[PDB]
Ligand binder design. Structure first.
Ligand SMILES: C[N+](C)(C)CCOP(=O)(O)O
Ligand SMILES: C[N+](C)(C)CCOP(=O)(O)O
Lengths: 128, 128
């Protein structure tokens, strides 16, 4: 009955947008375990760009979020079939092609972003 | 057995500091209900100063925090004996004199801040 959901991300300067996506992932089925993967500082820099918070900071903040049952920190940059078997993951939840193989397997669940609520957008707000 | 704890605050741009205080309040006893009071936009401005986020935004973010069982939004600026009876509150938890009457009654539990982890401190970090 219990369904294992995996959501990965940088989770830099966690904001309501991230929180809503985690909520959505958690609530995909009636009984879930939400595992959250937090990306390493080096791979995030190499593959994405600037990260403000350290892995420790990003991970520690996620611990306080209601929807998070387990954290993998650091997580792999790229999800593999071996990773899913290792952690007994039933679905991967992410914003929506590197996820084609997951969709082909029936193991992909889309979740939605929220614009405007960003931590950086809040500073853009204040300046006046 | 279940102990009702009340923590109030502005909770503007919620950060690890706030989250740790809420955790501390929640864990004061083995079985607790943590009620969190979120201050109104006008009273925060009048009595404290600038608030970046609206009451709705501050309240919505707190909903996602593991330790929060109930929210009173807006909450009164000043705690009263009548308020404690109304919500069946056993202890008030806050950083540590407007709380003298609570300490005299045995209804005050100190919780600690964390400096450096602030949302604004993180912007102070990045600029370089
Ligand atoms: C590649 N990755 C999925 C592990 C990290 C990027 O995820 P995200 O922060 O864009 O949601
Ligand atoms: C007066 N008050 C306690 C309701 C709001 C101020 O609380 P805080 O944000 O300084 O912890």
């Amino acid at each position: 009955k219990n369904v294992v959901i995996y959501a990965d991300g940088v989770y830099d300067m966690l904001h309501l947008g991230h929180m809503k996506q985690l909520e959505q992932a958690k609530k995909l089925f009636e009984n879930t375990t939400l595992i959250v993967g937090v990306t390493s500082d080096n791979e995030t820099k190499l593959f994405k760009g600037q990260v403000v918070q350290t892995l420790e900071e990003r991970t520690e903040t996620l611990k306080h979020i209601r929807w998070v049952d387990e954290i993998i920190s650091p997580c792999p940059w790229v999800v593999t079939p071996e990773f899913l078997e290792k952690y007994k993951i039933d679905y991967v939840a992410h914003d929506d092609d590197i996820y084609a193989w997951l969709k082909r397997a029936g193991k992909f669940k889309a979740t939605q972003r929220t614009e405007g609520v960003s931590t950086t957008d809040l500073i853009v707000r204040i300046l006046k």
